[PDB]
Design a protein around this ligand. Structure first.
Ligand SMILES: CC(=O)N[C@@H]1[C@@H](O)[C@H](O)[C@@H](CO)O[C@H]1O
Length: 156
């Protein structure tokens, strides 16, 4: 019988900097997460360019997955965590992994969230034609989590 901590008593923001960086990403067949979202800041909204994702504390084993209906060619991946209003709310101890369309029937790590809370890089050619992209959390966090940018950049 846990006591819900009410947070919809709204306050002036601490920072006036941009909270979210939308992109048109390739259409996903399925988007899943095991992380509870907050204040309707859904992972689908973040992927689809509507608003930032805000999740509760990640736990070891949590995933956020983007599945594609046909092999998808990707050039770069960016997941930007935290934002200026919530610099603590990063993905810690989390990988970005891809499931290649052909070549490996399991996910392979392509990026880590760095000391800025950013997982960003060019995708090597062997991982560039994908079935799915996901985040996988390797440890419990003390903090909630924000994704302020998701950009799955194609080579076109
Ligand atoms: C609405 C809000 O302030 N959400 C925060 C979150 O940013 C933070 O990481 C978490 C744990 O300290 O506590 C929540 O209340």
């Amino acid at each position: 019988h846990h006591h819900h901590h009410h947070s919809s008593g709204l306050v002036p923001r601490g920072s006036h900097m941009q909270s979210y960086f939308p992109h048109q990403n390739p259409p996903a067949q399925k988007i899943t997460t095991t992380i509870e979202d907050y204040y309707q800041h859904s992972i689908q909204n973040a992927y689809e360019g509507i608003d930032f994702f805000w999740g509760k504390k990640p736990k070891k084993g949590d995933t956020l997955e983007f599945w594609y209906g046909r092999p998808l060619q990707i050039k770069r991946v960016t997941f930007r965590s935290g934002n200026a209003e919530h610099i603590t709310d990063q993905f810690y101890n989390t990988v970005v992994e891809v499931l290649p369309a052909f070549g490996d029937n399991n996910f392979t790590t392509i990026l880590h969230f760095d000391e800025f809370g950013l997982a960003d890089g060019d995708v090597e050619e062997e991982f560039s034609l994908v079935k799915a992209i996901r985040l996988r959390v390797n440890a419990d966090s003390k903090y909630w989590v924000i994704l302020s940018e998701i950009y799955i950049q194609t080579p076109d």
